């Protein structure tokens, strides 16, 4: 296997309609299990919409691994996606 | 299967659309405000503080808001923070000759988000593309459509 | 002063087609080089054939002219301005549905823009 | 909890939405009618969330001169005066 | 036993649906994908 280097990355810089849903889902689960919230709350209660508030400001961990059909994969920071 | 949209209003709403956007309609202040607030109902949905209106189409000898102004008013209250108004030109379902010989209604034209001429019917909002609601879906994103 | 028209008009035909309320009237006047066809609320401001006008489209309605003159006031955007067939312009003013189309020879119809209007019709 | 102020009220308390409990159009429409008779109001239109429950969303926005709660109070007083005028004329009619 | 994530877990309350929970709707036969959607629930009183 290979971990494609940061200099040359051929995948789409857009946060695909799917990576957004799963990033928000897993961040919501994490925050639901007593994880650190990286952004000031204004009184919102649902352990998910907090993740929406995090993603609106791009203050979220959890880089994603995009698995190309070769078997290789890219490592994209969620700050790095568009 | 095809781009043609599938959601959209049905029988009663669209007949009352032909009857509301028609140009022989007129409202006093009370009916305008009341009908608008029935349409918006912000509190159950949220996100908005105070409802804003238009000036009246006619002002003397009695002040009267017209129907197309109610449609423009709804569009004005649902405009996002900073997106310029909608502007569009598209044929409507009720053919132009039914209203008059060389009638003007025919085809809805509306610039910067105010219904300038034309009436809304099954082609405008409903299971028909390139109308009002589909263009709102294109400009202002789905959750606003 | 922001007045954009002062022309006196005279009506020639009225209809009143499938509408109990507003009726389209055609009111060619001047030296026939001013072709105006608008709609009016024919329930609260009636007009017959050959009734005289005093039509002005202003920009801001702030003057004693509002109170003294302007027996009937509408309001609306002018959405299409064209110059066709000649040095002769045609303006289409919408009033929230009740349309209006005024054809004038690029003078006395110069100051027209694409903004709001405040039409004033006093008999 | 008869009357409460919904979470959409402006800080100046000028654009506020009372929610009258256990009422339907019977009072809503009448009070809206009387409130419109007030010059200093810009907007007044009532609704109903869902006919299953008895709650009436009200809504009153006014010019900065007078807040909205004073408008609602004056309007209710005027509607009471109207009811009293009607009952006086009615009672005086028949012996 | 000596596998210590039992201190990190939270106490899970099973809660009822409420006015924001997203609960799928469907209809058999579900031919094409717009036939199984997910609506927000609003909880009305009274009717069955």
Q: Characteristics of this structure?
A:
part of a larger assembly; 5 chains; A: 82 residues; alpha+beta; two-stranded antiparallel sheet; 2 strands; 10% strand; B: 145 residues; 3-stranded antiparallel sheet; 3 strands; transcription (chain C); RPABC3 (chain C); DNA-directed RNA polymerases I, II, and III subunit RPABC3 (chain C); nucleus (chain C); DNA-directed RNA polymerase activity (chain C)
C-alpha termini separation of chain B: 20 Å
For the biggest sheet of chain B, the summary is: 3 strands, antiparallel
Net shape of chain B: globular
Most residues in contact: chain pair: B-C, 31 and 26 residues
Structural class of chain A: alpha+beta
Elements of chain B, N to C (H/E): HHHHEHEEH
Biggest beta-sheet profile of chain A? 2 strands, antiparallel
Question: What is this entry, summarized?
Answer:
Chain E: It is found in: Nucleus, Nucleolus. The structure is cut from a larger assembly and holds one copy of chain A (82 residues), two copies of chain B, one copy of chain C (123 residues) and one copy of chain D (95 residues). Chain A has 82 residues and is of the alpha+beta class.
Task: Describe the overall structure.
The structure is cut from a larger assembly and holds 1 copy of chain A (82 residues), 2 copies of chain B, 1 copy of chain C (123 residues) and 1 copy of chain D (95 residues). Chain A has 2 helices and 2 strands. With 82 residues, chain A is of the alpha+beta class. Chain A has one domain (1-82). In chain A, strand 1 (64-67) and strand 2 (73-76) form a beta hairpin. The radius of gyration of chain A is 14 Å and the shape is elongated. With 145 residues, chain B is α+β, with helices and mostly antiparallel strands. Chain B is 34% helix and 9% strand. Chain B has a 3-stranded antiparallel beta sheet with strand order 1-2-3. In chain B, helix 2 (29-40) packs parallel to helix 4 (67-77). The longest helix of chain B has 12 residues, at 29-40. Chain C contains 1 helix and 8 strands. In chain C, strand 6 and strand 7 form a beta hairpin. Chain C is globular and about 35 Å long. In chain D, the strands form 2 sheets. Chain D has a 3-stranded antiparallel beta sheet with strand order 1-3-5, with no helix packed on it. In chain D, strands 2-6-4 form a 3-stranded antiparallel beta sheet, covered by helices on one side. The longest helix of chain D is centred in the C-terminal third of the chain and has 26 residues, at 68-93. The radius of gyration of chain D is 15 Å and the shape is globular. The termini of chain D are far apart. The D-E interface holds D 50, 52-53 and E 44-47.
